[PDB]
Write a protein that binds this DNA or RNA. Structure first.
Ligand SMILES: [Mg+2]
Ligand SMILES: [Mg+2]
Ligand SMILES: [Mg+2]
Length: 33
RNA sequence: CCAGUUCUAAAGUUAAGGUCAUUUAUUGACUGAUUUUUGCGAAAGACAUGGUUAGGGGGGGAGUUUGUCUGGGGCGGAAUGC
């Protein structure tokens, strides 16, 4: 509407570039933990 | 259930936008990009694998042996024991 108009992004496969998400479970951790 | 990327040797990153505050600045906070989960993912699973024993197999490889007499030695024969 104003010069500020919305610009969508599609994260379904084969689409725009995936964003940063919480990978905590999938992290590589040193032996000890 | 299907699709939100199939004519096209391109472009696709420090983002938009919404909601709420401050502050009037790409400032702050949520959302934009759902949730839960004391297995990154998959394949086998007490099987395989490893350990020690037991029976096979093994000139690939090690070691060694392969009598004596003897008209040279060998082939033959024993005048090798009686
Ligand atoms: Mg054996
Ligand atoms: Mg030999
Ligand atoms: Mg005789």
């Amino acid at each position: 509407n104003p010069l500020f108009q919305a610009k969508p992004r599609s994260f379904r496969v084969g689409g725009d570039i995936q964003p940063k998400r919480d990978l905590t479970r999938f992290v590589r951790w040193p032996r000890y933990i």
